[PDB]
Design an enzyme around this catalytic site. Structure first.
Site, mmCIF file in Angstrom:
data_model
loop_
_atom_site.group_PDB
_atom_site.id
_atom_site.type_symbol
_atom_site.label_atom_id
_atom_site.label_comp_id
_atom_site.label_asym_id
_atom_site.label_seq_id
_atom_site.Cartn_x
_atom_site.Cartn_y
_atom_site.Cartn_z
ATOM 1 N N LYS D 10 42.615 -19.024 40.166
ATOM 2 C CA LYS D 10 41.478 -19.227 41.071
ATOM 3 C C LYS D 10 41.427 -18.108 42.105
ATOM 4 C CE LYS D 10 38.969 -22.864 41.178
ATOM 5 N NZ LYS D 10 38.302 -23.209 39.911
ATOM 6 N N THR D 57 42.348 -24.033 36.732
ATOM 7 C CA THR D 57 42.081 -23.297 37.979
ATOM 8 C C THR D 57 41.666 -24.231 39.117
ATOM 9 O OG1 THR D 57 39.751 -22.607 37.676
ATOM 10 C CG2 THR D 57 41.469 -21.270 36.613
ATOM 11 N N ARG D 176 36.599 19.531 64.642
ATOM 12 C CA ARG D 176 35.676 18.635 63.949
ATOM 13 C C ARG D 176 35.956 17.189 64.338
ATOM 14 N NH1 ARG D 176 37.995 17.933 57.628
ATOM 15 N NH2 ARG D 176 39.911 16.941 58.369
ATOM 16 N N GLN D 228 45.648 14.683 55.009
ATOM 17 C CA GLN D 228 46.930 14.699 54.327
ATOM 18 C C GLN D 228 48.094 14.776 55.329
ATOM 19 O OE1 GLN D 228 44.093 16.298 53.337
ATOM 20 N NE2 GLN D 228 44.098 16.679 51.123
ATOM 21 N N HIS D 256 32.429 11.773 56.607
ATOM 22 C CA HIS D 256 31.993 13.048 57.190
ATOM 23 C C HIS D 256 30.861 12.865 58.203
ATOM 24 C CE1 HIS D 256 34.441 14.820 54.050
ATOM 25 N NE2 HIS D 256 33.719 14.219 53.129
HETATM 26 C C1 LIG Z 1 36.574 18.757 54.761
HETATM 27 N N1 LIG Z 1 37.517 18.397 53.698
HETATM 28 C C2 LIG Z 1 37.343 18.744 52.368
HETATM 29 O O1 LIG Z 1 36.353 19.360 51.971
HETATM 30 N N2 LIG Z 1 38.392 18.310 51.559
HETATM 31 C C3 LIG Z 1 39.234 17.549 52.478
HETATM 32 O O2 LIG Z 1 39.026 16.079 52.305
HETATM 33 O O3 LIG Z 1 37.633 15.635 52.564
HETATM 34 C C4 LIG Z 1 40.772 17.554 52.477
HETATM 35 O O4 LIG Z 1 41.467 17.769 51.492
HETATM 36 N N3 LIG Z 1 41.334 17.277 53.694
HETATM 37 C C5 LIG Z 1 40.685 17.167 54.928
HETATM 38 O O5 LIG Z 1 41.309 16.766 55.908
HETATM 39 N N4 LIG Z 1 39.353 17.555 55.023
HETATM 40 C C6 LIG Z 1 38.731 17.788 53.925
HETATM 41 C C1 LIG Z 2 36.960 -25.685 34.827
HETATM 42 N N1 LIG Z 2 38.086 -24.759 34.668
HETATM 43 C C2 LIG Z 2 39.253 -24.834 35.411
HETATM 44 O O1 LIG Z 2 39.418 -25.675 36.295
HETATM 45 N N2 LIG Z 2 40.180 -23.859 35.052
HETATM 46 C C3 LIG Z 2 39.467 -23.063 34.057
HETATM 47 O O2 LIG Z 2 38.960 -21.788 34.652
HETATM 48 O O3 LIG Z 2 38.011 -21.985 35.777
HETATM 49 C C4 LIG Z 2 40.091 -22.475 32.781
HETATM 50 O O4 LIG Z 2 41.272 -22.178 32.657
HETATM 51 N N3 LIG Z 2 39.202 -22.288 31.757
HETATM 52 C C5 LIG Z 2 37.873 -22.720 31.692
HETATM 53 O O5 LIG Z 2 37.157 -22.343 30.766
HETATM 54 N N4 LIG Z 2 37.404 -23.601 32.660
HETATM 55 C C6 LIG Z 2 38.153 -23.799 33.683
#
Ligand SMILES: CN1C(=O)N[C@@]2(OO)C(=O)NC(=O)N=C12
Ligand SMILES: CN1C(=O)N[C@@]2(OO)C(=O)NC(=O)N=C12
Ligand SMILES: CN1C(=O)N[C@@]2(OO)C(=O)NC(=O)N=C12
Ligand SMILES: CN1C(=O)N[C@@]2(OO)C(=O)NC(=O)N=C12
Lengths: 301, 301, 301, 301
Positions: D10, D57, D176, D228, D256
């Site tokens: 779930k 579920t 920047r 980085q 940016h």
């Molecule tokens: C302006 N710019 C880039 O053109 N590459 C970079 O990441 O966006 C990069 O590798 N590192 C930055 O900090 N700035 C960047």
């Molecule tokens: C009603 N119901 C559940 O309560 N568990 C199930 O998945 O949601 C499950 O294991 N399989 C279903 O097809 N139907 C479900």
């Protein structure tokens, strides 16, 4: 301290490309969002303020547009492989390029029953994606996917026979709604490089179409025992139809639609066979995952 | 102090309804999100802690589901009118009900070329909406709309001849991309009550279909001088096709796609006639609005 | 057909401005999102493809940045008034400018107990907004607001004595959670022009601070009979503290937190006085609105 | 075919819990969103329609609420470990539980300079998260993080000395803006089980506070050579302050803010030393990642 892992690059690069057939007048459009992250001998940019090893993310962005100008952008598996290959070949010290592409739908409009030459509709927010990991000396690993394919069936879904103990309140059902957002991924055999990718180019669009077709037909036709059982059938069929796929992964939310007991109001009957009005639940949701590959068991089958 | 205006109710009420034809097996689904806000002799709930005048929002929610169980939920203009009428009739002291409905798409799947009886796809996030204001003694005012209809054309859009002064940098163009998200609203003649709404029921789906058809065909076929000029043509055509509409409103973003000059890199030509790769701009965006009605000028035309 | 209403311009214009005190080293930042939509003698752009009457949205964008370079951007009421006034004065044929500004928080960081000269944190997604309508010949109408102020109190909220009929299931309560997202708007007296706005400049920040303070203290201290009753107290207090305000509007969702009956599991007691674990509900939600002004009743009070 | 991997459970389970001190009147609230996904001997639910192996579920959801009723929900590392341990102990055939928790801020209000006993504000959308993987026979692996911490500094950021070739257009800069959304993760030593987690409970809140403090102070005080270089300093300091951490990961977008050349308009100077008004860019964005651990190089250092 030391750098154990590092990657960097440009994310959220929106790209459009048009093809214009000057003979016919037909134009075709492509739109995507691209991410490229690089790895290599870059640790000194982190540890030593050594910017000499950084291919600027701005330059990565420029490169994405240049590559789209000089090459096809479809299939996305090919475009991603060309793009990733460029970085590892151009820069001695860059040893991997990780290219993610999300392809947005622009489906040609039909106007008065005829396909229009230059007008398009976003007919779904469903995406077609790729993840292309180009690793120097280890080829090209591609995962292809469809995502955001939202579906519902109003009957022919069941869920009974599940474990019941002191934590269980859920009623068994033999007739329920089933709705999900399909995320399906097919993982290709490793390719040795760009030539091998190019040799398989038609298989990319064909396998995406198969995966979509199988998904929809199996969802629509399977009288489903569970999400688990239905999704497995999808995966097994896709594997059977493309031998160059190694695995198929599904990740499916169970988007619950609850019955509404109205019997407190004038004896209104709106449950079981008389259920017509339901409350879609936004949260929580089941989430069901599996990765299916081909079998290698030879005994105890 | 005094209360000058007040309204309250339940928002974001998700509602599904299914119709099952037991003869044919064909099922049809409807899903919406509903808001109902009430006005009336309620000021003492604000000024005097007098809760006796409050129909609880929880009860409004219950009422939405009960009304969907007991009535058709389509067309949404009708459902909203039934729902709003209920509150002003049931509660002497409630004098207006404001009902907003967003209808979500569940389009029947075609599997192997045949429409499936109980499986559906969200084929677009486009919505069909209504705003139904039921005001005691003053009838029912309905605004119908489509929204989230996202379109693009790759040529046959122009923008030149605009005002140029010391604030202007924009280049004139005779060939550009045009993309928008269409929000189109048609405002009905006031209806005297629920009987009059019911008397026009087929016109609701028909007018929505006309509005959509006109929108798409005009977008696709107009060699557009501006967003302004194109949207006006849409509106005038819709007015011509349904006399029970008084006005048509469009609200259209101009979702810009910028050319990318690549001539700094190896002399690559990607502008003007050679423009193939573009940068979709997320923001800012033009936003163009108008409300069109029928003319009443008889001189100076 | 004829144009009944029209407005157009640039939306989603992101703007940052820095102030640098070169003596002290202290820098101060401002970030906003701006929309400007114009009205005037523009109908022929819609009806006649007459672009001569259009001040391009691109030029509107340029103008926003130029105006921010040449003037203070704070308080936003002032900036919006300067911006709107520019369009109606510069262009004879433009007769109204509608300026919406959303101000984003950049709160100065405290590092080791001392305010840092040039580093900031987005300490909340709460916004401060204005809507400034500059209408030629009719002055400047300003609505100021705070929005996205999300609060919760764990007790000292009640809801009982509401109408009960055949649509009602809600239990009365004398002790519940209350949570909302506050949207509060104060509407200023009409100003005759930019000089009058400038004459009141200190009142803008002061009234925003009062509105926020009153909102928080009243929410925290009122043993609330209903959302309605609590919000009215807020509004009446703000009106009492600024005579140049004509009305105060609140729009408050009731973001429900449901008790969870666990008595089916090992007799666990988690309701009423023993309620500790609750299920926040995403939807639906109550939505409670009112507009409060000063009284003019002299009898039947 | 065969199942290669599977997990299910779930997601999106919203949970609130209140603590009430009946002596002092002070109440304290906690709100989270929880996901629990299980692994184990479940493959036949996929391959054989065998629902007997499925812990529904819905029952997983019930269990989350029951566990929150019976145990502390703070620190989230502890709650997640208790929850995950329950599934692998209760169900023989379940062999891993993957618990993700997002903790939402509810900071106590100060009213008239005094902390209020039962009123809270969402003072930031910043989250505190955990990922707790409880794997039968292999203990408990915990990753703790803060995310959504949005910051900006207006000077004392630089970026020069980067690689320049035929793909490069970016200007070097010595002054920047730097803005990011911090996602920082610290990975704990494997714990053998719940007793070992409990033995370290005070370290969880203390290490989260250290990570936040280091992040903010280093961002504010480092005259940054690159994202980085700055992020590496953060990580090295966190590692130095908690020996039970093995690695620290940062993932930082470079959000940016572009200068705007206004020299075309009346010679306005808004670049370099005269830059005051900037255009925040929504996309694209740099994305810079690294994982830092402790060194083990003994030569070639
Ligand atoms: C302006 N710019 C880039 O053109 N590459 C970079 O990441 O966006 C990069 O590798 N590192 C930055 O900090 N700035 C960047
Ligand atoms: C009603 N119901 C559940 O309560 N568990 C199930 O998945 O949601 C499950 O294991 N399989 C279903 O097809 N139907 C479900
Ligand atoms: C390019 N452009 C503008 O600069 N203003 C306009 O709206 O965005 C306008 O008024 N109409 C347009 O169609 N195109 C435009
Ligand atoms: C529990 N509840 C309702 O059912 N209606 C109310 O708004 O949500 C209402 O009118 N006022 C409340 O404060 N509480 C409510």
């Amino acid at each position: 301290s030391a750098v154990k892992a590092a990657r960097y690059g440009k994310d959220n690069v929106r790209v459009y490309k048009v093809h214009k057939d000057e003979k016919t007048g037909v134009q075709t459009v492509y739109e995507m969002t691209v991410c490229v992250l690089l790895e290599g001998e870059i640790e000194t940019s982190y540890t030593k303020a050594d910017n000499s090893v950084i291919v600027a993310t701005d330059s990565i962005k420029n490169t994405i547009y240049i590559t789209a100008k000089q090459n096809p952008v479809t299939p996305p598996e090919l475009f991603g492989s060309i793009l990733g290959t460029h970085f590892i070949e151009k820069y001695n010290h860059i040893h991997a390029a990780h290219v993610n592409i999300v392809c947005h739908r622009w489906t040609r409009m039909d106007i008065d029953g005829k396909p229009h030459p230059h007008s398009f509709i976003r007919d779904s927010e469903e995406k077609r994606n790729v993840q292309v990991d180009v690793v120097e000396g280890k080829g090209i690993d591609i995962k292809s996917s469809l995502s955001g394919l939202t579906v519902l069936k109003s009957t022919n879904s069941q869920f009974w026979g599940f474990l019941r103990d002191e934590y269980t309140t859920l009623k068994e059902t033999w007739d329920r709604i089933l709705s999900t957002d399909v995320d399906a991924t097919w993982q290709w055999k490793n390719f040795s490089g760009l030539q091998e990718v190019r040799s398989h180019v038609p298989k990319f669009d064909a396998t995406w179409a198969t995966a979509r077709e199988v998904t929809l037909k199996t969802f629509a036709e399977d009288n489903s025992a569970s999400v688990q059982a239905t999704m497995y059938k999808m995966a097994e069929q896709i594997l059977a139809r493309q031998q160059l796929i190694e695995t198929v992964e599904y990740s499916l939310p169970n988007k619950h639609y609850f019955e509404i007991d109205l019997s407190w109001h004038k004896g209104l009957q709106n449950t079981g066979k008389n259920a017509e009005v339901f409350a879609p639940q936004s949260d929580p949701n089941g989430l069901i995952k599996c990765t299916v590959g081909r079998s290698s068991l030879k005994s105890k089958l």
